[PDB]
């Protein structure tokens, strides 16, 4: 639907939509920008991620509210299940849209470590969101798709980025959450968070004041999870 709008205008409108807290619009503008077929800059990748994370974050929060109501009712009519299913189908549609952009063709064109890790982290995240609602015969395959994307991103990040790099840290944070919440592997989650935190700490001395702030912010999230989990 964005085919007639200039790439630069889509990016500009995505930034306006962010300021206006219109995240559905923001995601639609960024989808249009991706579909222009050019690679995305660092700033543009961040806009894409912010837009879809906010859209799917609202859907996930709503799904959790409805799932809790549904579980209490099963301890009435079909309405709670029907509405939870409606929200779930919408959420799955957004995840499928993001995964489709990554597969056509953001990942295959991403050769630099920063871009490839970013997109593989996204792929892991959106399969993780699908896994949160999955219950059928493809749930194990959904979980393995998330794991495989995160693992490839981890392998690249360890070879190509310093331990304080914000995308490397955020990837490790999210893969640890995957281990804890999705894969039923709390020890792996804790080990990954601890090792990531400690290796970043030992590399902070190389950073400028601004980079130090970026890295320590994400390290604090790792610490918050370790405090919750231990």
């Amino acid at each position: 639907a964005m085919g007639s709008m200039e790439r630069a205008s889509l990016i500009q409108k995505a930034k306006l939509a962010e300021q206006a807290e219109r995240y559905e619009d923001m995601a639609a503008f960024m989808k249009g920008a991706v579909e222009k077929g050019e690679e995305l800059s660092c700033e543009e990748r961040n806009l894409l991620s912010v837009a879809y994370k906010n859209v799917v974050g609202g859907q996930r929060a709503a799904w959790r509210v409805l799932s809790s109501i549904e579980q209490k009712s099963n301890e009435k009519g079909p309405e709670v299940r029907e509405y939870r299913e409606k929200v779930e189908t919408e959420l799955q549609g957004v995840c499928d849209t993001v995964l489709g952009l990554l597969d056509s063709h953001l990942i295959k064109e991403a050769g630099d470590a920063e871009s490839r890790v970013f997109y593989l982290k996204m792929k892991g995240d959106y399969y993780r969101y699908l896994a949160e609602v999955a219950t059928g015969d493809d749930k194990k395959r959904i979980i393995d798709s998330a794991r495989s994307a995160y693992q490839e991103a981890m392998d690249i990040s360890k070879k190509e980025m310093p331990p304080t790099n914000p995308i490397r840290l955020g990837l490790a944070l999210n893969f640890s959450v995957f281990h804890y919440e999705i894969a039923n592997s709390p020890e792996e989650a804790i080990s990954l968070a601890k090792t990531t935190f400690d290796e970043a700490m030992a590399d902070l001395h190389t950073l400028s004041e601004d980079s130090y702030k970026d890295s320590t912010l994400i390290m604090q999230l790792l610490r918050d999870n370790l405090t919750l989990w231990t």
Binding site: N174, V177, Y180, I218
Partner: peptide, 7 residues
């Protein structure tokens, strides 16, 4: 629920 990456 633990924290995944957030702004």
């Amino acid at each position: 629920r633990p924290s995944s990456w957030r702004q």
